Design a protein around this ligand. Structure first.
Ligand SMILES: CC(C)(COP(=O)(O)OP(=O)(O)OC[C@H]1O[C@@H](n2cnc3c(N)ncnc32)[C@H](O)[C@@H]1OP(=O)(O)O)[C@@H](O)C(=O)NCCC(=O)NCCS
Ligand SMILES: O=C([O-])CC(=O)C(=O)O
Lengths: 434, 434
């Protein structure tokens, strides 16, 4: 009823059967071709893996178990007094395929509060890290070190039945998600608040609120922003580096801690998790150079100059998209409600009215619309979260929700080791001649 | 000259132009098909990536830049007064595609000696890790923490040209390889020798010898074993989880420290890097039940009984190999030379005589021949290294050579982000129906 674990136990046989049926009908059906170019091009365009939790709708943006962002905003439980979807709800959705009730979300909040304690060896290690070790490296190292807590790793050693893997994956994933705000808050405080304590978990608060408390923030609007942010960055299909990495490392039966840590190493890559930062830097430098009271015309002028030097307009354009990412719109509405007077926000709203100015005036992009990362920095900075080197840690805490919901299902469904075949250039040149 | 970095700088343009033409002429050529089953089955049999350093014939086993293990055992430099190939030469081969001279190997030993220092925060973290944190977790966490020393990460943030990425990746890889024995030996001694010190690096020893010194082994044969072990586990194509994880995380421009630590979390998975231990636990059990000097007859009994009960013979089979693993034969040759009368070895050899026979007599094999992991445990245990949980740390140190060699090249050749397309079961169903 409230116990997600039993609800999941009842859902798994149905999904197994549905998959078995489809594979028995179509296992040998060709869904795509592999070219030499795909091999050299990072598997671009190649349908490579099954990932159940989210799908990119090319006319509506990301869908979470079939629900668009606007639909999650309407349907997911809010905190009492709140307008923003609780990440607990999102996770319940990703795991079950169902919108939770308020009571299920409350049960989930309390489950994560109960599991939130850090072992001292991780507290120690975090407390010993130097300030020149990047927050993401601290996050990954700590999560790795938490695997001393792994239920799954120990059960596997004892010879547990395959039919039970998902249960221990579930437990470890619940433990991890509950711990992550503690880890992330310890890093923030050690780096930017002189090593002060994170304080206590409150059994009766949602996950986002316990998080913003441990960070040392008090602002209701910042907790609402955090609720939204953690919901919308939660999952984006399986093919992004962080999801894929978790998937790949999980497929070797590495526990959730190791899988998630590896994922965070992928997220730390400049081409995956640093878009938030690049935008904000660019906005800062812009606003200082043209002033707050900049007119459309002069701002338009600036953008043209930027692009006349083959410099990118950060956060406009994407890999796979076709319209304003609802993940942006979502933050825009937030800002228009809560900080309409803020200068940097007013610039970001001004860049939205003007920048689309055709990336088809080129032909060498694919989209003139802003992605999620064009809006996130200004909101964080507005609320006093100015340490841009930490922004990817927030993305990482969000992304836990998606990749762990999927990891539970991958083991439930008995997905095997991921092991594609590689070839060398020499090998391939020979292969194409034969 | 002897400077590998200048030699590599001269090779790269050649290979760039050769790939550019090949892709121009044959980029659209189809090399394979994707089926529904491949998507559900972990990309099994799917040509997914280009990986230049090594190629596995299902038939004759791994080739390092076109050279088999037997060929490398003869051609690669040895230590003065030794018979086993030095890992240094293997790395040189993987990087350049050329067999090194003695002098080049000597230069590379000294480069690694000089780069071997750990920063104080990493020494501290290792000394503080508790005894219930697995060696592989310690190794991954430590390597992640070393990324404070990344030249690549700092250059990237300053806006270095893409033409130069390979240089900083090379520098960081050389630093990581140099440090890994220090990290590995600290772990070993902290866990298994009550925290005693690793001592010092000798500037004129090879990498493997410095390593065994720091582990506390002084036996010349154990150094020779280590030299061979680190050479032969170095690389096994791009599709294995450790190499693939490194490739995938690397493709987001994460530095070698992050890429490698992610790879280790993959290696730590039971389906990837725990086979050695699983073999050795099975053999030990076997040699209790059926006694010390068992007869072929009684041995074949146990093997039949194992198969009958639906139980697996660890150490036999593979995801692509379909014949005796040359990495096994290697370890056999070493055993026949150095420890023929060892009882546990006699069993391993006995099992090679029996197990392949009965495995086909059954016919549910696909690969009835032993892989590397069938043979390594009894060699390690022979020399006093009985801490099974540590064995995968040795594999990891070896594998750095292959994956970092390839990572230099991936960046040199400008390989993009790895980003396959995922699909849900529902989405795939709809895709196929359309
Ligand atoms: C390596 C391994 C996992 C590859 O399996 P795979 O490619 O998925 O499977 P195969 O093509 O061999 O499958 C044929 C059947 O023979 C079985 N099989 C393979 N090797 C076997 C062995 N040594 N003993 C018993 N059964 C074996 C498989 O499990 C499979 O059984 P099933 O079809 O009834 O489910 C498998 O051979 C194995 O279990 N090896 C033992 C562990 C080991 O040594 N691993 C180290 C390599 S990474
Ligand atoms: O995948 C994308 O297009 C955006 C992204 O990096 C993520 O959310 O993972």
């Amino acid at each position: 009823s409230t116990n997600l674990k039993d609800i999941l136990a009842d859902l798994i046989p149905k999904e197994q059967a549905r998959i078995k049926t489809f594979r028995q009908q179509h296992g040998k059906t060709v869904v795509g071709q592999i070219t030499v170019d795909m091999m050299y091009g990072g598997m671009r365009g190649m349908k490579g893996l099954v990932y159940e939790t989210s799908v990119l709708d090319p006319d509506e943006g990301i869908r979470f178990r079939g629900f668009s962002i606007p639909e999650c905003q309407k349907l997911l439980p809010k905190a009492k007094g709140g307008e923003e979807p609780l990440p607990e709800g999102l996770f319940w959705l990703l795991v079950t395929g169902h919108i939770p009730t308020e009571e299920q979300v409350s049960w989930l909040s309390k489950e994560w509060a109960k599991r939130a304690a850090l072992p001292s060896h991780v507290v120690t290690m975090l407390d010993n890290f130097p300030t020149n070790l990047h927050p993401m490296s601290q996050l990954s190292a700590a999560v790795t070190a938490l695997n001393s807590e792994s239920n799954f790793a120990r059960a596997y050693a004892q010879g547990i039945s395959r039919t039970k893997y998902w249960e221990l994956i579930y437990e470890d994933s619940m433990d991890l998600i509950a711990k992550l705000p503690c880890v992330a808050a310890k890093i923030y405080r050690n780096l930017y608040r002189e090593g002060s304590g994170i304080g206590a978990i409150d059994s009766n608060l949602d996950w986002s609120h316990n998080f913003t408390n441990m960070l040392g923030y008090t602002d209701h609007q910042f907790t609402e922003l955090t609720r939204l942010y953690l919901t919308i960055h939660s999952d984006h299909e399986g093919g992004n580096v962080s999801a894929h990495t978790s998937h790949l490392v999980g497929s070797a039966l590495s526990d959730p801690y190791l899988s998630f840590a590896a994922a965070m190493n992928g997220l730390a890559g400049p081409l995956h998790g640093l878009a938030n930062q690049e935008v904000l830097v660019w906005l800062t430098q812009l606003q200082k150079e043209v002033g707050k009271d900049v007119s459309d015309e002069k701002l338009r002028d600036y953008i043209w100059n930027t692009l006349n030097s083959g410099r990118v307009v950060p956060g406009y354009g994407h890999a796979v998209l076709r319209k304003t990412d609802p993940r942006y719109t979502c933050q825009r509405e937030f800002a228009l409600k809560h900080l309409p007077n803020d200068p940097m926000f007013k610039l970001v709203a001004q860049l939205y009215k003007i920048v689309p100015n055709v990336l088809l005036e080129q032909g060498k992009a694919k989209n003139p619309w802003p992605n999620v990362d064009a809006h996130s920095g200004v909101l964080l900075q507005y609320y006093g979260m100015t340490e841009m080197n930490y922004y990817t840690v927030l993305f990482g805490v969000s992304r836990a929700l998606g990749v762990l919901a999927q990891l539970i299902w991958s083991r439930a469904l008995g997905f095997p080791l991921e092991r594609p075949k590689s070839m060398s250039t020499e090998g391939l040149m020979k292969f194409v001649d034969s």
